[PDB]
């Protein structure tokens, strides 16, 4: 329909990581500020949209939420090439979902832009009694890869806002230095 747009930037984001780590719940906390405890695993892919403000500019965030289960891999693959930032999510109560982060990283390296912005979320950081992945170990992984990390909880609403704005701010800053230098 070719009408004037109501945003200045458009950031395509991608959440990836194993089934059940809480990717959908983290996005629904960011986009609706709600939390449902019942598991509704993501069939293939879904998306949510939120517009935020950075340095007084309108940033539309088109956030793509992939299925973690193996049978959806070909479907979710199609969504890597366009992403500008990617949340790699694991579950602090599940060591496998954290070991698998380095597989998710290799997946990105195979399918995404060479310079995509990456962040690690250790989610469910409200379930201390069941913790398997120390906070120190998530930090050293992300340091080993030179990318940012934080512990999140969609349920207790911990670091969800901060994760997306930080990733949004880092995409914007790199983009602005590209646009300015062209």
């Amino acid at each position: 329909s070719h009408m004037a747009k109501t945003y200045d930037y458009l950031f395509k984001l991608l959440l990836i990581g194993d089934s059940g780590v809480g990717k959908t719940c983290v996005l629904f906390r960011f986009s609706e500020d709600a939390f449902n405890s019942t598991f509704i695993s993501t069939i293939g892919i879904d998306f949510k949209i939120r517009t935020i403000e950075l340095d007084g500019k309108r940033i539309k965030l088109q956030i793509w939420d992939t299925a973690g289960l193996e049978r959806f891999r070909t479907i979710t693959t199609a969504y890597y090439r366009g992403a500008m930032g990617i949340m790699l999510v694991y579950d602090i109560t599940n060591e496998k979902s954290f070991d698998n982060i380095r597989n998710w990283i290799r997946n990105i390296e195979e399918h995404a832009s060479a310079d995509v912005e990456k962040m690690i979320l250790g989610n469910k950081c409200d379930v201390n009694d069941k913790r398997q992945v120390s906070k120190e170990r998530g930090e050293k992984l992300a340091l080993d890869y030179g990318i940012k990390f934080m512990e999140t909880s969609a349920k207790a609403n911990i670091n969800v806002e901060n994760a997306f704005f930080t990733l949004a701010r880092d995409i914007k800053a790199k983009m602005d230095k590209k646009l300015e230098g062209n």
Partner: peptide, 12 residues
């Protein structure tokens, strides 16, 4: 795959 991916793409 074709069946599910088609309906998903329309849903999007």
């Amino acid at each position: 795959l074709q069946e599910l991916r088609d309906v998903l793409q329309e849903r999007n």
